[PDB]
Amino acid sequence: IESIIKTATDTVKSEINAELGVVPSLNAVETGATSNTEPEEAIQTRTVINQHGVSETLVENFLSRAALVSKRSFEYKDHTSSTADKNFFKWTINTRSFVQLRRKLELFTYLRFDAEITILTTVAVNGYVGLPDLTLQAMFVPTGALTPEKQDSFHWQSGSNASVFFKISDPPARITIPFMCINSAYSVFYDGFAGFEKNGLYGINPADTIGNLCVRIVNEHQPVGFTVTVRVYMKPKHIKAWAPRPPRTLPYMSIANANYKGKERAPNALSAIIGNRDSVKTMPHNIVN
Amino acid sequence: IESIIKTATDTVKSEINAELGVVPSLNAVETGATSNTEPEEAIQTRTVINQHGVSETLVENFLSRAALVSKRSFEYKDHTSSTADKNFFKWTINTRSFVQLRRKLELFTYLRFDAEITILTTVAVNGYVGLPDLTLQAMFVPTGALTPEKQDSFHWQSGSNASVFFKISDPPARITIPFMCINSAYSVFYDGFAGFEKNGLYGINPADTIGNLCVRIVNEHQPVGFTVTVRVYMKPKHIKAWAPRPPRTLPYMSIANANYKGKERAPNALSAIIGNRDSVKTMPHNIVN
Amino acid sequence: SMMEINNTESAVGMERLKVDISALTDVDQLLFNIPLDIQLDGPLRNTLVGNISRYYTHWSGSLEMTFMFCGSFMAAGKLILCYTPPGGSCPTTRETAML
Amino acid sequence: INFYKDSYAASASKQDFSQDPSKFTEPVVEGLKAAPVL
Amino acid sequence: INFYKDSYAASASKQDFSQDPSKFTEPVVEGLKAAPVL
Amino acid sequence: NLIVPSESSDTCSLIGFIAAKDDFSLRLMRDSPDIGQLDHLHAAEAAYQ
Amino acid sequence: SDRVLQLKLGNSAIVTQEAANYCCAYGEWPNYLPDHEAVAIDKPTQPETATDRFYTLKSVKWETGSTGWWWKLPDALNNIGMFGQNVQHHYLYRSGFLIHVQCNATKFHQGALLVVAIPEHQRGAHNTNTSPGFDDIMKGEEGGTFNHPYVLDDGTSLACATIFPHQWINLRTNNSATIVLPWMNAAPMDFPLRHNQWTLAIIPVVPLGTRTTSSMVPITVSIAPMCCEFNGLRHAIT
Amino acid sequence: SDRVLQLKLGNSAIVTQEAANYCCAYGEWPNYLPDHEAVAIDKPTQPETATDRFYTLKSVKWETGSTGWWWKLPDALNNIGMFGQNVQHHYLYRSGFLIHVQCNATKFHQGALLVVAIPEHQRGAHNTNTSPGFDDIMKGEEGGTFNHPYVLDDGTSLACATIFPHQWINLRTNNSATIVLPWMNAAPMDFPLRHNQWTLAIIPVVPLGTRTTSSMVPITVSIAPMCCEFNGLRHAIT
Amino acid sequence: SDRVLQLKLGNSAIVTQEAANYCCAYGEWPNYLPDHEAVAIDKPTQPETATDRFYTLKSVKWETGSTGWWWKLPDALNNIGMFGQNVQHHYLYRSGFLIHVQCNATKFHQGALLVVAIPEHQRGAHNTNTSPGFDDIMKGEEGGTFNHPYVLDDGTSLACATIFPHQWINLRTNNSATIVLPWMNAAPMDFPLRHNQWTLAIIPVVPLGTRTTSSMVPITVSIAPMCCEFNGLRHAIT
């Protein structure tokens, strides 16, 4: 039954029980139900007025954290004879590349959220003169649409695309991307194939991809070269979450799939998730006095 | 009939129709009317409560985007022996030079709007020492009025002209130009000649030109040279739009006219706007399993 | 607004905006098909609905195709115009399409 | 938020949801009975 | 504080304290008498 | 079948039209791939002269 | 009962028995300039039946390789009758237009004509940076011909020209098209000799065809100005 | 009184006398798509008893080294009966599922089977960067086998799979598991041939054991689709 | 106002502008089987728009020496779409039929077609004591041809066939015939593969004639089953 829960539940005092027909510590796991045995029914308890809040484990709190989603270092220089991000990069936006955010989102099957995007930019002089206050353009391009192929390309005029101009000196750039799936929730996992033929990608519904982030330096190249690193942070907000999942246990291999190998030995090995102890009778951190 | 439309229309369920005299799928294109055939009248439908918003295709949303209208790079240096923008430029303001904004505005015959102008300024050292925090003057001069001919000219004292002083370090300069046409709307297209004789320009009503933007660097020249690039962004707002038009299909040639050539082959060629397929029976991206 | 259904070589300019129909001597024949891909280049792209929609990424709702026969008064005929929901290949025989 | 003395200085006005598509889709005066038009 | 015209621009919404753990802990229709389930 | 007179044209023409209905909606505004430039347009420099 | 139509203006009348429910451009009807929109303070002359009447242009021949025809308004009428005389003697004019386009053929003919009124049809030139000159644009009563009707001689498209006020003459269906135009301008009045509010375009989308013995099939344009006002009286320009 | 259970759907019925209080996934029951959630505007076909009925799959043999079995829905049913025919003739489908899993043995046998319905069971491949292909995922009526049931073939864990709708067949206790599945998708309807909403997983957590003379102990899966709707009628894909 | 007709069933629609006031056979309309007439006790499947929709048969060529064409119902439809799939998977069926027959030609063509729905058209063979076999009767979608249309291939008469539900396609007058058929059987339901309730007969009473240059003049049959019910679900017969 649905109810408003702001604090953990109280304990009532309980007394001696000796009743035929009533076995609250016995259960049937086979039904799929978790045991309903209360502590009052298992031991003799006191009255506890529990005032412990539950708000930090709200799904909103658990997922409205700015987490790193993209980190691109690129050279800011004259690029006449390079082979590589020539004063700009494109990034197909995904939540799969950095495993702390990925595992948290993969606790759920479906997520609906707005995405507050924060763009941190840092500069280093190539191996000193000072750090320039460069202007950057981050342009949101939808998935599969035409992205710029040059720093100076006329695609950056951005007639309808959202673009954000921002410094290095100023506070990171910040915008909110709305929940933009064509469905009512993103599919965190997708047991299916994106195309009507059979060559399409498994596990990737492109309905859940936000877009392309096209980031350039607006400035013409300086006579010396710089290395510019752009960090992108996503914070989900106004979150609804459905159908919780077993957490990822083995290390991630790819951003494209749930493929697994495991570590060489326990912990988090394919044959052994938990590290070993000597026997089932061995107490690993036994207090000995 | 005029009505307030916030969402796309619902669908009502429909049943079998077999009525003499009533042919809702038949139409007469010759009258110039678009077909009034409802899906309820063509197929057997369900009831759909449609909650899809229409607000992103409001003309205000469709056109209140900051779009690039001007991009001038000029040298900031001692100009005693140059031939070229000598620490300042004049720009006759127009919406015709950057084709993403131009095509959107040319969806309409008449536009009435205020213009929020944003001025982005970037500096590069000529081919390193650091980037200077230069002060710029953008002065609005009406069309045909006296513009400065020097960086140091006494025209820049700006006794009645609106001028904006702004840094490179600070957030781009931003002002709003009001709707300033002598008519109640700008003429996006003008089937006429501006003068009372016959040498005048076709297609250009000067009543629709905002003015001249006169942009200098206020600073005296440094001992080294810099290249300064000024980007101007216009966002129309409080927009009224009249008489929609066929979109531009061929590439633009000039900012002065609607002259056309088309690409060499399809797509967007003079003899072929849409790219070719093999036959009218050829399905170009046919699903084959 | 007009679809460019005859988007073929040997079709020049305004010829692309009409589909020629001839008398046949075999029954149940295919005359033309029309891809419904607005995003790639097809007969729907340079339409009012096509051009405005390509300023957007997402779309929903019903379309309508209207076909005006421009033969003589004395010309007679019947056509079947079929929409096939996606999943398979485009129907090439009349007995498949009008399912 | 708008602390300027001129009204054109205001932010964009995105609340006009009035539409009349019949001036483009049906610019005849005989409203067509949805029945043959001719 | 939220001076934007789009509601998704708002700060995070951390006040939904409604819970229904029985859709995960007791997804049967015979509510189990706390008495043997079987 | 198309069945015509000897004196009518034996080949006839269809014109196809498309419109959206009023249940139609569009979403997520983007730059149109139907227009582009690789250069400045003609006489765009004369706006600076 | 929408196939037959009589249009009576002044001393002029037109009957057709194969119309197809006339177009009122943007659902509007021509009116005189109201006091709350007026600019010119002199009392205008409103000649009414002397000018608001059908003027028939020179017919053009519809042939196999015809690309189309255009007439600019008020330029096509600026030398005709009392309309032309009022235009020449006044700095300012204002009117609507009733356009009737006529084309009949036999029941064995086929052909489709797009009859579209294009507001501010600013023409482009093909394959040059030079803007169209005065003689390219201002053809008078004779009108012009489309160079590239597929792009409407302005780099856009014929296929999307149905966004403009239009009708069709499908020879199987109807023999006439009627378009009622309001005043369509950014200014309440305009100088008639240097600006054209409307362009009547008539474009062969399906070409003329028959296997009967051929006849000249002409296309005839009758245009009635509506609610003519004129301001700024002086000598004639001519 | 929760050990015995009869399930009647269409012309099909199943009795068991060793159930253990059936699972309704997330406390939900299958329903038809309501009008305020619908997208496809065509009137759907709701075949009811022709499709909403128990279909029994091929039984699998429970052996000593069995790793487990999986079937994907609706893929396992897409070639069976009138459900399969409606799936092939329609772009869109929607249904819930009633899953009944049967496994009996003697009172001298032991064994525990985890019978879990996994929504969006996106499979991983072992020890490669290459995503699973079409033939790895889409097994049809036969279903597949777990490669690594301890990590549920997706790098997570069997041990936490009880977060999903599940029952157990503990051979000492019960001989059947029943799971009622609602529609579980981000979209109200879906194309049946390229997406699988649910994966029925049946996993040997305690292996089969006895010291009696052995018998084949099979595990039998009966699945009834529930509240079947189909939209977008056309020819069959096959 | 009885010359034009639109028929909308399911996702199918048919327009004609030369109808002639459709026939409702014996003044009846198709209905579902009511409870006070039902026999089979299982709950029937009523697929509605999946089966109650126009199916177009293969067109036949109308030529100078054509004797006529016949199709038997439900036999002509028993392999088509979801109707055919429901027929194959069910012992029992019941439906009405909406028949639309199309034949156009020029205003210089002449010809009269008798379009008649014959209930229980038990065929005779000519000049033998042997009854017609299975392959003579059961032609499927292709239908058959009259051997002796003057006696309706059963020793009776074409001339009295207007006692049956019928229309005429007189090429001068109309280009289409529409006949609505109710369930017409001694039993409330029937096994679809061994019995044909109705035979659509299309018979050249006045042959095709013109002195224009000839065209293929085909005759096209579209048939919508109406109020389809199916009982006795099992595997497909095929």
One-letter amino acid at B87 equals: N
C51: DSSP letter = H
Chain A residues close to B168, C-beta within 8 Å: 133
**What residue spans of chain C are helical by DSSP H?**
48-53, 94-97
Could you give the count of Cα atoms lying within 13 Å of H53 in the half-sphere of its Cβ?
18
Rounded to the nearest 10°, the torsion over CA H196, H202, H203, H208 is -160
Alpha-carbon gap: F48 to the closest alpha carbon of chain B (Å):
5
Distance CA G173, CA A102 (A): 65
Query: Which residues lie across from A88 on neighbouring strands?
Result: A216
Q: Work out how many CB contacts closer than 8 A connect B with F.
A: 82
Q: How many CA atoms lie within 13 A of A209 on its CB side?
A: 22
Chain B residues whose beta carbon lies within 8 Å of the beta carbon of residue H40: 46
CB contact under 8 A, B58 and D37: no
Enumerate residues 6+ apart whose C-beta is below 8 A from A128.
none
Tell me the two tokens of residue A80.
């006449």
- According to DSSP, residue B285 is labeled T
Select the residue of A185, A203, A246 nearest H160 (Cβ to Cβ).
A246
Q: Which residue on chain H is closest to E36 by alpha carbon?
A: H2
- For residue F10, which residues of chain G lie inside 8 Å, CB to CB? 211
Contact B284 C42 (CB under 8 A): yes
Alpha-carbon gap: D19 to the closest alpha carbon of chain E (Å): 21
DSSP string computed for I155-176: TS-STTGGGSSEEEEETTT-SE
How many other C-beta atoms can be found within 10 angstroms of the C-beta atom of residue I233?
23
Judging by beta carbons within 10 Å of its beta carbon (0-12, 13-18, 19+), is residue G190 exposed, middle or buried? buried
Contact I8 B18 (CB under 8 A): yes
Structure tokens at E29: 């229709």
Q: What is the Cα–Cα distance from A204 to A258, expressed in whole angstroms?
A: 11
Four-point Cα dihedral G7, G12, G17, G23, nearest 10: -40
As a residue count, chain F comes to: 49
CB pairs under 8 A between A and H: 154
Any idea which residue has 């840092």 for tokens?
Answer: A122
Enclosing H/E stretch for H203:
strand H198-209
**Which residues on adjacent β-strands are paired with residue E8?**
none
| Dist. CA A267–CA A277, nearest whole Å | 11
- In sequence order, the 6+-apart residues with CB closer than 8 A to the CB of H136 are H123, H125, H144
Q: Please, which residues bridge with residue I179 across strands?
A: I23, I99
Is-contact G62 G218, C-beta < 8 A? Answer: yes
CA distances from H154 to A250, G112, G205, H71, H151 (A): 9, 63, 60, 15, 6
Q: How many C-G residue pairs are in contact by the CB < 8 A criterion?
A: 68
Q: Which chains lie within 8 Å of chain E at 3 or more CB pairs, if any?
A: A, D, H
* Other residues' Cβ atoms within 10 Å of the Cβ of residue A91: 19
Method: cryo-EM
In 3D, which of I55, H174, I109 has the Cα closest to residue E37?
H174
For residue B8, give the 3-state DSSP assignment. coil
Contact I6 B23 (CB under 8 A): yes
Of I116, I77, I102, give the one whose Cα is nearest residue I175: I102
CB contact under 8 A, A182 and C55: no
Q: Is B227 in CB contact (< 8 Å) with chain A? A: yes
CB count within 10 Å of CB H117 equals 23
Give the integer Cα–Cα distance in Å for I144 and I137. 8
F3-32 residues touching B, CB cutoff 8 A: 15, 17, 19, 21-29, 31-32
Residue B233 CB contacts under 8 Å (≥ 6 apart), including other chains: B66, B67, B68, B69, B117, B118, B119, B120, B172
Contacts of I124 (CB under 8 A, 6+ apart): I132, I153, I154, I155
> Closest Cα of chain H to A248: distance in Å?
4
* Interface residue A27 vs chain E (CB under 8 A): yes
CB contact under 8 A, B244 and D24: yes
**Is H191 in CB contact (< 8 Å) with chain C?**
yes
In 3-state terms, what secondary structure has residue B284?
Answer: coil
Q: What is the 3-state secondary structure (H, E, C) of chain A?
A: CCEECCECCCECCCCCCCCCCCCCCCCCHHHCCCCCCCHHHHCCCCCECCCCECHHHCHHHHHCCCEEEEEEEEEECCCCCCCCCCCEEEEECCCCCCHHHHHHHCCEEEEEEEEEEEEEEEEEECCCCCCCCCCEEEEEECCCCCCCCCCCCHHHHCCCCCEEEECCCCCCEEEEECCCCCCCCEECCCCEECCCCCCCCECCCHHHCCCEEEEEECCCCCCCCEEEEEEEEEEEEEEEEEEECCCCCCCCCCCCCCCECCECCCCCECCCCCCCCCCCCCCCCCCCC
CA A123 to chain centroid: 26
Tell me how crowded residue A223 is: count the other CB atoms within 10 A of its CB: 13
Integer Cα distance of H198 and A192 in angstroms: 11
Could you give the CA distance from residue H116 to residue H23 in angstroms, rounded to a whole number?
10
Task: Judge: I15–B22 Cβ closer than 8 Å, yes or no.
Answer: no
Chain A CB contacts of H166 below 8 Å: 32
Q: What are phi and psi of A155, to 5 degrees?
A: -60, -25
Nearest residue in chain E measured CA to CA from D11: E5
End-to-end CA distance of chain C: 28
Establish how many alpha carbons lie within 13 A of residue B166's alpha carbon, considering only the half-sphere containing its beta carbon.
18
Q: Which 3 state secondary structure label does DSSP give B122?
A: strand
Amino acid in position B173: A
- Least CB-CB distance to A196: which of C55, C58, C86? C86
Give the full edge-to-edge strand order of the sheet including B212-217: B88-92, B212-217, B136-141, B163-166
* Longest alpha-carbon distance in chain B: 90
Q: Give, for B27, the enclosing helix (H) or strand (E).
A: none
Q: Which domain holds residue H171?
A: 1-238
Count of alpha carbons within 13 angstroms of residue C10, beta-carbon side: 5
* A215 contacts A89 by C-beta, under 8 angstroms: yes
CB contact under 8 A, H43 and B46: yes
CA distance linking residue B33 with residue G2, whole number of Å: 14
Beta bridge partners of I143: none
Which amino acid is present at I216?
Answer: M
* Minimum-distance CB partner of B43 among I1, I2, I13: I13
> What CATH number does residue H154 fall under?
2.60.120.20
G124/B259 Cα distance (integer angstroms) = 4
Q: What six digits make up the tokens of I65? A: 């020496």
Total domains, chain H: 1
H225 close to I (CB below 8 A)? no
DSSP H or E run through H87? helix H81-89
Going from the N-terminus, what domains does chain B have, and what CATH number goes with each?
1-289 (2.60.120.20)
Assign 3-class secondary structure to chain G.
Answer: CCCCEEEEECCEEEEECCCCCCEEHHHCCCCCCCCCCCCCCCCCECCHHHCCCCEECCCEEECCCCCCEEEEECHHHCCCHHHHHHHHHEEEEEEEEEEEEECCCCCCCEEEEEEEEEECCCCCCECCCCCCCHHHHCCHHHCEECCCHHHCCCCCCCCCHHHCCEEEEECCCCCEEEEEECCCCCCCCECCCCECCEEEEEEEEEEEECCCCCCCEEEEEEEEEEEEEEEEECCCCC
Q: Which chains touch I (3 or more CB pairs under 8 A)?
A: B, C, F, H
CA distance C12 to A241: 55
Helices and strands in chain I, H and E counts: 2, 13
Amino acid occupying residue I85:
Q
Helix, coil or strand: residue H151: helix
Contact between chains at I218 and C95 (C-beta distance less than 8 A): no
> Which residue's structure tokens are 């519809």?
G62
Distance separating alpha carbons of residues H152 and H119, to the nearest angstrom? 13
Instruction: Give contacts of C52 with chain B, Cβ < 8 Å.
Output: 57, 107, 247
Closest by Cβ to B183, choosing from G72, G177, G187 = G187
Interface test with B, best of F11, F15, F23 (most B CBs within 10 A): F23
- Per DSSP, the three-state class of B124 is strand
Determine how β-strand H23-24 pairs with β-strand H144-145: unpaired
Least CB–CB distance from B280: residue in C13, C32, C66: C32
Q: Which of C41, C81, C46, C3 is nearest to B284 (CA)?
A: C41
Q: In angstroms, what separates the C-alpha of E10 from chain D's closest C-alpha?
A: 16
Encoded tokens for H60: 């699998």
Nearest to I118 by CA among I60, I161, I76: I161
Question: Two tokens at B131?
Answer: 């980037």
Q: CA-CA distance, C98 to B113, in Å (whole number)?
A: 50
Q: Do F15 and G110 touch (CB under 8 A)?
A: no
- Give residues with Cβ within 8 angstroms of A16, minimum separation 6: A44
F31 contact residues in A (CB cutoff 8 A): 141, 145-146, 155, 158-161
